[PDB]
Amino acid sequence: ASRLYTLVLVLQPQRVLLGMKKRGFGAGRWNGFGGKVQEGETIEDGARRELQEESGLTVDALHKVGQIVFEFVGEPELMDVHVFCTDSIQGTPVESDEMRPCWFQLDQIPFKDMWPDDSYWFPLLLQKKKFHGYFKFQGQDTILDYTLREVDTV
Numbered sequence: 001a002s003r004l005y006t007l008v009l010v011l012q013p014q015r016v017l018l019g020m021k022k023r024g025f026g027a028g029r030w031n032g033f034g035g036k037v038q039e040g041e042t043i044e045d046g047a048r049r050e051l052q053e054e055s056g057l058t059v060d061a062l063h064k065v066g067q068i069v070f071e072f073v074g075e076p077e078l079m080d081v082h083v084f085c086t087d088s089i090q091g092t093p094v095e096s097d098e099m100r101p102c103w104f105q106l107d108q109i110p111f112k113d114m115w116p117d118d119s120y121w122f123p124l125l126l127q128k129k130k131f132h133g134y135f136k137f138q139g140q141d142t143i144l145d146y147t148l149r150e151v152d153t154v
């Protein structure tokens, strides 16, 4: 009862690209670029596709940095999110109907307007750590329970 997703962070030496979700689910929060993995696609190829489709960037190399399971109490399906990083991109971000991209300096990451779990694992991603996490939510705002650990192998 777990569904595969990817989440990709475009991370350069002193800045990160985030996209504000403009409409629909999770609207009003900044996030990386993510989506469902397709039948017949590897997780990595899904991550590349989601990044390119949502941001307009071309990614040349991607690195897996974490895996986070999300549970919403009462909802049967878990989200098994595979998190990736890249700093080897081409092109410029494209604003769309769905997504407004902005670059952020690392000291100005907008955690108050992100999913609350990000406050826990983003610092690990920024420090080039790898991790395994689990977050149990009640609705979209409240973390009931979590675990997070650093790993050498995702």
Ligand SMILES: C[C@]12Cc3c[nH]nc3C[C@@H]1CC[C@@H]1[C@@H]2CC[C@@]2(C)[C@H]1CC[C@]2(C)O
Residues within 6 Å of the ligand: 005, 025, 026, 031, 034, 070, 079, 081, 115, 116, 117, 118
């Ligand atoms: C993985 C997300 C995004 C996120 C960033 N930091 N933390 C999170 C957790 C959050 C958990 C819910 C996910 C949501 C992604 C969009 C999902 C899968 C949504 C469920 C349905 C939808 C819109 O497809």
